[PDB]
Structures are given as C-alpha cells and as structure tokens.
C-alpha cells in the first residue's frame, strides 16, 4: 500500500464515524486503490467503510447510452459491495450539497475520493471542501503511476513522458491485495434510471424512421463483462494487435475503453495480465504504449493544463501555425448538425460518424481522421475544438474523459505531436488524407458497414 498513491485535498478534524469513499471515476470493487485505501483507513479507525456515489445534475449533457451503461454497472456494483458488507449510497444531486450533507448526517470520520483531473471534478471538490470539516484525501486509482508522481509538469511529447513513466513502473506496477470485507454489516437504481431516461428521451439519437440509432449490445456493462472483454482480448486479439490496430475494418482493438472510462476495470489489472501473457512482442509493446503511455499522458495533460480544452494549451509552434492560416479560405464549412448527422462530402468522415452514432465507440484510427477533418472544415480552431468535444462527449461511451480532451488536442492542435509539412488552413498540424487512409486499409469496406 504505497502512500504515494494518496494525496491530501484538505486538512480537517477526524470524526469518529465511518470512512466514506466518494466514488466517482473508479466504479469497481476489485483492483481499486481508492477503495483499498479507504478500507485500510477504516480498519485503523475501528469503523466501517461505506461507498457514496453522486448521481449528478449533469447527466442530461450526455445520452441514455452512457447513463444506462454507467447505471447498469452500478447495479452490479451494489451487489458486489454488499457481498463485502460494504453499503453503498447513491445521492441524487451534485456533490457540494450531497456529500457535505451525507458526511454530516452519517457522522463520517474521513472522506476519500478517487482521482480525476477534469474540471467538473475539481469544481465538485471545491464545493465539498467548503462544506466539510473532516480530513479529505484523494487516491489515484486510475493510473498505474500516480499522476502527480509520474512527472512534476506537463510533458510535451510521449518521448519525454515515456522514460519517466517506465522508470517508475518497477515501483508502482504491482499486484492488488484482496479487499477485506467490513467486519460486520453496518429508491432503486432501476427507478433512478427510469426517471433519467424519461428526462433524456426527447434528445435521444433517432433515425428519421424514429428508430433509435444506438445499438446497446456491442459492449455489455459492468465489472464481470469487462473482465471477459479483457480475457477475450488477450486470447484472441492481442497477438494481432500490433499489425491491425490501425485498421478500422477489423475488430481487433481491446474494446476496453468504455469500461476503463467508468473504472469498471483497472488499467493496472489489464497491464498485469498483458505483461504475463505470451504474445508477439511487438503487439504487447504497442498495446502497453497505448494503455500506459498515451492513457496516462492524457491525465498528465489535463492535470497540468487548466486550459486543456482550449486553443491556449496547444504548443506554441501549433498556435503560431494555426494563427498564420486562420484567414485561409476553408474548402468546406459544416455546421455542428451537418457533422453530427454525417452529412459532409467526405464518405469516410460520414462513416466514422455513423460508427460513433450506432455503436458509441468510433475506431481509434478514424477518431484521428474525424477530428482532423473537423479542424479542416470549420471556421476556426476554436470552433473545431468545440464541435469535436461536443460530439465526442455526447456520443462516445468512453467520452467526457482526459483521453478525449488530450486526443482532440493532439488531433486539432498538435498536442504531443510535432510540426509536419505546412499546408493552407491546417498549417503544420499533421494531416490525415482520405487517399492516405485508402492506401492503409479497406476504406470502402468500412464505409459500406457504416452506411
Ligand atoms: C479525437 C480523439 C478522441 C478520443 N476520445 C477519447 C475518449 O473520449 N475516451 C477515451 O478513452 N479515448 C479517447 N481517445 C483515445 C482512443 O481513440 C480510444 O481510447 C480508443 O480508440 C478506445 O478503444 P479501445 O479501448 O478498443 O483501444 P485500444 O487500442 O485497445 O487501447 C487500449 C486502451 O488504451 C488507451 N488508449 C488507446 N489509445 C489512446 C489514445 N490515443 N489516447 C489515450 N489513451 C489511449 C485507452 O484507455 C484504451 O481503452 C480519443 C482519440 C482521439 C484521436
């Protein structure tokens, strides 16, 4: 139990009641350092640990697709926590009011949360801090190396983050102890879900048909399903991962991101299991570079760049280049709605958007293509960011995520990239031509599937 995984958010005066884990990003009972640390604090204080989760007011900014995925996972999590004699409380409202009142009503001794560098989580933390008098910690349960330990600063390139992260893997890549049950046992989510779906229904994504776009059978939610997705990746897809990760016609990615986003599975767990797997070495190297380096550099980016969703966080070479080309005439301009409906003149863009609409998980390779075309066919880089973020967060099951803001910033602003050949409109931002994709994979086949 490495104390570098835990950080103080606010000093206070310990109470004598239960330890409260305010669960937010890591919605799982296994392999969860935030829950493990909370249990350990509780054991030392001779009190139970309890879990609280806030069903916030912001759910109406995404769709049923994410809400159902999350809540069905939480239904399973209730069962799992209760088998460990750990009660769970689902508070309807936003954390400032609800966590502060829970702490008071339940005489909590200590408050622990998990770690997210996103602005909304920090907004919540500030409001909670002002409503409590007990000590308040956070634990990095999402990264193998705690974000504030991996580097002291924003890293401008994967090649400067990678050696720092790997220098720390021998220390921090380690097995998880079993979660000790509590010593004794100290509105349903279904009804919550029904109420939420009712509120979301008018904005559900539909065909002109009125038939719903989303297909909810591609990724079944919850901890158990996540483990099966991990196991089938290692058994059936990891060998081919190195060769096929950039081919969106093949179903050869891990498909773990929706689970990783909600923390229904630990990336540290996935890494442990992949490390021990015997597969082609280039495949393992490639996969670990995505789930370790690119995933954790995305937390690095959001943690150290308050303006991570804005033009100002782009590297200076990219800001200067995009500025130099700000007044270039765009070959096309599309509205948010035209992008959203897949109604551009580019059939590969449209098919990428259709994959997002129907499955909630656009292939990683075409996400790069897609965001770069939003840059190319919008009035400014600032507008491009807004559109890409809006669509990514509204329709990706894995959205509203540091990987999203960092991936969009990479695509549009060259964050964690270098200058390439100068073009009009897009300046030196890496370009991803349609023709280049055709040389790379069977574009026609991808278009046929998603049209
Ligand atoms: C414009 C754009 C937007 C993106 N938005 C998101 C988002 O909202 N949420 C999200 O989780 N990922 C996002 N990504 C990163 C990446 O596209 C997805 O993580 C990946 O496609 C998810 O599929 P998978 O789990 O099957 O991937 P795999 O290839 O199996 O990768 C395994 C895991 O590694 C991590 N990973 C892989 N690629 C990246 C990457 N480029 N950056 C960061 N972490 C990575 C993810 O945790 C992923 O689940 C975005 C990328 C771009 C270019």
In order of start, what are the domains of the chain with their CATH numbers?
1-141 (3.40.50.620), 142-310 (1.25.40.80), 311-451 (1.10.579.10)
Q: How far is 86 from 84, CA to CA, in rounded Å?
A: 5
Q: Is 367 annotated as a binding residue?
A: yes
Tokens of 137: 């910690």
Q: How far is 360 from 298, CA to CA, in rounded Å?
A: 20
Could you tell me whether strands 6-10 and 19-23 are parallel, antiparallel, or unpaired per DSSP bridges? Answer: unpaired
Q: How far is 394 from 389, CA to CA, in rounded Å?
A: 8
Would you give the distance in Å from CA 404 to the centre of its chain? 7
Residue 391 — φ and ψ, nearest 5°?
-75, -40
Q: How far is 404 from 411, CA to CA, in rounded Å?
A: 10
Q: What is the 3-state secondary structure (H, E, C) of the chain?
A: CCHHHEEEEECCCCCCCCEEEEECCCCCCCCCHHHHHHHHHHHHHCCCEEEEEEECHHHHHCCHHHHHHHHHHHHHHHHHHHHCCCCEEEEECCHHHHHHHHHHHCCCCEEEEECCCCHHHHHHHHHHHHCCCCCEEEECCCCCCCHHHHCCCCCCCHHHHHHHHHHHHHHHCCCCCCCCCCCCCCCCHHHHHHHHHHHHHHHCCECCCCCECCCCCCCCCCHHHHHHHHHHHHHHHHHHHHHHCCCCCCCCCCCCHHHHHHCCCCHHHHHHHHHHCCCCHHHHHHHHHHHHHHHHHHHHHHHHCCCCCCHHHCCHHHHHHHHHCCCCCCCCCCCHHHHHCCCCCCHHHHHHHHHHHHHCCCCHHHHHHHHHHHHHCCCCHHHHHHHHHHHHHHHCCCCCCHHHHHHHHHHHHCCCCCCCCCECCCECCCCCCHHHHHHHCCHHHHHHHCC
Residue 387, judged by CB atoms within 10 A of its CB (0-12, 13-18, 19+), counts as buried
Residue 181 — φ and ψ, nearest 5°?
-60, 155
User: Given the CA of residue 398, which atom of ligand 1 is nearest to it?
Assistant: 9
Q: How far is 75 from 88, CA to CA, in rounded Å?
A: 10
Q: How far is the CA of 74 from the centre of ligand 1 (A)?
A: 23
In the sheet that 88-92 helps form, which strands lie side by side, from edge to edge? 6-10, 136-139, 110-114, 19-23, 49-55, 88-92
Ligand 1 neighbour 417 (Cβ under 6 A):
no
Q: How far is 2 from 149, CA to CA, in rounded Å?
A: 12
Residue nearest to atom 48 of ligand 1 (CA): 257
Residue nearest to atom 22 of ligand 1 (CA): 257
Residue nearest to atom 37 of ligand 1 (CA): 290
Q: How far is the CA of 257 from the centre of ligand 1 (A)?
A: 6
User: Given the CA of residue 364, which atom of ligand 1 is nearest to it?
Assistant: 21
7: Cβ contacts below 8 Å, ≥ 6 apart: 137, 138, 139, 140, 146, 148
CA-wise closest residue to 369 among 287, 431, 435, 441: 431
User: Given the CA of residue 256, which atom of ligand 1 is nearest to it?
Assistant: 25
Q: How far is 148 from 372, CA to CA, in rounded Å?
A: 30
Write down the residue that tokens 């504030």 correspond to: 148
Q: Are 413 and 382 in contact (CB under 8 A)?
A: no
Q: State how far the alpha carbon of 30 is from the alpha carbons of 7, 19, 88, 184, 222, in Å.
A: 21, 18, 15, 19, 12
Q: How far is 364 from 443, CA to CA, in rounded Å?
A: 14
Q: How far is the CA of 109 from the centre of ligand 1 (A)?
A: 38
Write down the residue that tokens 């220390």 correspond to: 171
Ligand 1 neighbour 396 (Cβ under 6 A):
yes
Could you tell me whether strands 6-10 and 136-139 are parallel, antiparallel, or unpaired per DSSP bridges? Answer: antiparallel
Q: Are 354 and 366 in contact (CB under 8 A)?
A: no
């Amino acid at each position: 139990m490495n104390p570098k995984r835990i950080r103080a958010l606010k000093s206070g005066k310990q109470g004598d009641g239960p330890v409260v884990y305010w669960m937010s990003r890591d919605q799982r009972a296994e392999d969860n350092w935030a829950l493990l640390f909370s249990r350990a604090i509780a054991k030392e204080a001779n009190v139970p640990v309890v879990v609280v989760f806030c069903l916030t007011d912001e759910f109406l900014e995404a769709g049923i697709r994410q809400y159902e995925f999350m809540l069905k996972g939480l239904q399973e999590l209730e069962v799992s926590l209760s088998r460990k004699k750990i009660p769970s409380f689902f508070l309807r409202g936003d954390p400032g009011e609800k966590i502060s009142r829970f702490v008071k009503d339940y005489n909590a001794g200590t408050l622990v949360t998990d770690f997210s560098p996103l602005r909304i989580k920090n907004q919540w933390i500030e409001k909670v801090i002002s409503g409590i008098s007990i000590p308040f910690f956070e634990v990095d349960a999402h990264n193998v190396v705690p974000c504030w330990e991996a580097s002291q600063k924003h890293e401008y390139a994967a090649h400067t983050f990678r050696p720092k992260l790997y220098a720390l893997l021998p220390e921090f890549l380690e097995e998880f102890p079993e979660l000790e049950p509590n010593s004794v046992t100290p509105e349903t989510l279904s009804d919550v879900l029904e109420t939420g779906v009712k509120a979301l229904l008018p904005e559900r994504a539909l065909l002109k048909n009125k038939d719903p776009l989303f297909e909810p059978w591609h990724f079944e939610p919850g901890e158990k399903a996540a483990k099966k997705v991990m196991e089938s990746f290692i058994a059936d897809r990891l060998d081919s991962y190195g060769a096929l990760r950039n081919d969106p016609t093949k179903n050869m990615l891990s498909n773990l991101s929706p689970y990783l986003h909600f923390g229904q599975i630990s990336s540290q767990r996935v890494v442990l299991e992949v490390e021990k797997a015997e597969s082609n070495p280039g495949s393992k190297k490639a996969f670990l570079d995505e789930i370790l380096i690119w995933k954790e550099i995305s937390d690095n980016f959001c943690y150290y760049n308050p303006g991570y969703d804005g033009f100002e966080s782009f590297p200076s070479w990219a800001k200067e280049s995009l500025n130099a080309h700000r007044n270039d005439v765009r070959s096309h301009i599309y509205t948010l709605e035209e992008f959203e409906a897949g109604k551009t003149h580019d059939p590969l863009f449209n098919a990428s958007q259709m994959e997002l609409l129907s499955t909630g998980k656009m292939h990683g390779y075409t996400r790069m293509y897609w965001a770069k075309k939003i840059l190319e066919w919008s009035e400014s880089p600032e507008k491009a960011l807004e559109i890409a973020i809006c669509l990514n967060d509204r329709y990706e099951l894995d959205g509203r995520d540091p990987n999203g803001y960092a991936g969009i910033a990479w695509s549009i602003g060259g964050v964690h990239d270098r200058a390439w050949g100068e073009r009009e409109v897009t300046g030196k931002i890496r370009y991803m031509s349609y023709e280049g994709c055709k040389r790379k994979f069977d574009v026609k086949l991808y278009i046929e599937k998603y049209s």
